[PDB]
Design a protein around this ligand. Structure first.
Ligand SMILES: OC[C@H]1O[C@H](O[C@H]2[C@@H](O)[C@H](O)[C@@H](CO)O[C@@H]2O)[C@@H](O)[C@@H](O)[C@@H]1O
Ligand code: MAN
Length: 362
């Protein structure tokens, strides 16, 4: 009915025409640096699922420049090692995807360097495990930094030469995450952990439920299944997904459209504008593993129909075409944050989220 591959390329062309900076090999320097790594992930995954290699040259140029020691964190010594573990995690998983697309061991070596870098802030003395997100302060063990790390060690357990240690690290990380309390009573993941003032024990801080905190964990459990052939990991991922799928949990609208919790008040900041695309791409990873792990043709079809239903709503209601000029013949599509509301503007985080949903249906 619809060509998700064609609309994905048009969305990537719209991302490049309005937000790419050739002089810096980066999308929107006025936006967070880690979202540029998410945009790189979506472009690499587009090329992987579609078999195309249009943006290969552009993406290697981005890596070569962003590999260098960051001006705001020279102690990281480059290779995407930043002042925050989650920032490093986004780029590390992008290198895992580039290694899957090209097979170049160079990109896998970056993810290995990033794993050892992030492990430096894993402590068993607080919360019984987990790593911090604020490297400079060490005051928060949130969900995203531990979900990105868990998916990284689980991915290296399937690709790295010394994969046994990465499997043990991933198995012990999922054990800590499941026992941390971040997964609440409805199988949704709150934002992070809080520390008791007197006892020191950690507990769910009951902070907002973000869509991207229910996606990265799915890809981690998928990789944990590919490394162990244990369908128990998928069943855990299906429970988290099914909770997001249920309209009674507030994440799925009555029309069946994914809605971030800030969309109602129109207060989604620069970070939250990209959350939805991250979940969609990871949900496609979970659906692909579920359909292959069983013989039922209807396996994972609930997840495919959801991504399809969300695509048509974003197409019909959130799309906007770039105006071609007599000097600038750049064609492409632009998208806002609400996958069902109206198009009012378009920024790079919302554009990257739109690409993720199109790629999640290829
Ligand atoms: O006051 C700091 C600010 O950041 C922390 O939230 C981070 C992350 O855990 C959240 O998922 C996203 C959501 O926008 O923002 C940060 O990256 C928390 O300490 C949060 O309470 C706070 O607003
Ligand atoms: O309250 C839980 C959590 O919320 C804050 O936003 C963070 O900065 C942490 O320091 C704290 O532990």
């Amino acid at each position: 009915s619809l060509n998700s591959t064609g609309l994905a390329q048009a969305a990537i062309n719209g991302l490049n025409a309005r937000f790419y900076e050739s002089s810096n090999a980066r999308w929107s320097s006025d936006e967070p640096w880690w979202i540029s790594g998410v945009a790189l992930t979506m472009v690499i995954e587009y090329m992987r699922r579609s078999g195309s290699k249009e943006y290969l040259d552009q993406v290697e140029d981005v890596i070569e420049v962003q590999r260098q020691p960051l001006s705001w964190w020279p102690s990281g010594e480059g290779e995407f090692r930043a002042d925050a573990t989650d920032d490093t995690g986004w780029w590390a998983l992008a290198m895992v995807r580039m290694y899957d697309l090209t097979g170049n061991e160079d990109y896998l070596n970056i993810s290995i360097k990033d794993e050892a870098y992030m492990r430096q802030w894993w402590t068993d003395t607080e919360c019984g495990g987990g790593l911090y997100v604020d490297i400079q302060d060490l005051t928060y063990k949130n969900a995203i930094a531990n979900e990105l790390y868990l998916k990284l060690v689980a991915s290296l357990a399937n690709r790295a030469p010394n994969a046994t240690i990465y499997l043990d690290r991933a198995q012990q990380a999922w054990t800590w995450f499941l026992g941390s309390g971040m997964i609440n009573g409805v199988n949704l993941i709150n934002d992070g952990l809080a520390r008791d003032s007197n006892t020191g024990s950690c507990y769910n801080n009951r902070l907002p439920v973000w869509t991207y905190n229910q996606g990265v964990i799915l890809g981690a459990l998928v990789e944990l299944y590919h490394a162990t052939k244990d369908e128990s990991y998928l069943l855990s991922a299906q429970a988290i997904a099914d909770a997001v799928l249920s309209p009674s949990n507030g994440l799925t609208s009555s029309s069946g459209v994914l809605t971030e919790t800030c969309e109602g008040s129109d207060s989604c900041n620069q970070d939250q504008q990209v959350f939805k695309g991250v979940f969609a791409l990871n949900l496609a990873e979970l659906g692909d593993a579920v359909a292959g792990a069983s013989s039922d043709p209807d396996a994972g079809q609930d997840y495919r129909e959801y991504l399809d239903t969300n695509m048509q709503s974003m197409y019909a209601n959130d799309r906007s075409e770039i105006v071609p000029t007599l000097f600038d013949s750049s064609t492409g599509d632009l998208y806002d944050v609400s996958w069902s509301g109206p198009f009012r503007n378009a920024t790079m985080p919302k554009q990257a989220s739109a690409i993720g949903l199109y790629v999640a249906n290829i």
